[PDB]
Design a protein around this motif. Structure first.
Motif: not given
Length: 142
Positions: A6-9, A11-12, A15, A97
Motif C-alpha cells: 500500500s501507500g502511506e497511512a 501524515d508527515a 507521524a 505505528e
C-alpha cells in the motif's frame, strides 16, 4: 505471493507526534528484564518462534525493525487480498505505528498485548485531539 504494498497511512506531521510522544514516555517508562524473558523462550515454543528470534537478535539490525514493524499489528493486516479494504480508516492507522514504535524501545511490549493496547490508544487519541497550528506569536492574517 504478494506483489505491491500500500501507500502511506499517517501524515508527515501526524507521524512526528507519534515519534515525539513515544520518545517522551520511554524515559519515564521502565525497562524490561531481557534475561528473564530469555529463559521463558527456551521453555516455550510458540513465543520463541513468534517473536523469540527478535529477543536473541541484536538491536542495531535493520531486520529487527522489519520483524517488529510487521508483528506490531493490532488493527491493520500484512496482506492485501480480494477487492476489500475495511480495516484502517484513520485511527487504526495511528494505533499501528503508535505501538510499533513502542515495541522497538520495549521488546517485551511485543508479548504484552493489553499493555501495548492501552499505550497505543493513548497516543492515538492525542494526535486526533489537536490538528495543525492555529496561531503563531499572535494573530494570523492571511
Amino acid at each position: 505471493g504478494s506483489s505491491g504494498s500500500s501507500g502511506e497511512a499517517l501524515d508527515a506531521a501526524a507521524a512526528l507526534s507519534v515519534a515525539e510522544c513515544v520518545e517522551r514516555m520511554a524515559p519515564t517508562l521502565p525497562k524490561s528484564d531481557l534475561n528473564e524473558v530469555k529463559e521463558l523462550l527456551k521453555t516455550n515454543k510458540k513465543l520463541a518462534k513468534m517473536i523469540g528470534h527478535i529477543f536473541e537478535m541484536n538491536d542495531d539490525d535493520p531486520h529487527k525493525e522489519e520483524e517488529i514493524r510487521k508483528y506490531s499489528a493490532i488493527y491493520g493486516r500484512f496482506d492485501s487480498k480480494r477487492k476489500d479494504g475495511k480495516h484502517l480508516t484513520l485511527h487504526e492507522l495511528t494505533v499501528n505505528e503508535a505501538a510499533a514504535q513502542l515495541c522497538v524501545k520495549d521488546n517485551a511490549l511485543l508479548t504484552r498485548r493489553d499493555e501495548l493496547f492501552a499505550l497505543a490508544r493513548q497516543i492515538s487519541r492525542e494526535v486526533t485531539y489537536k490538528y495543525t497550528y492555529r496561531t503563531t506569536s499572535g494573530p494570523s492574517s492571511g
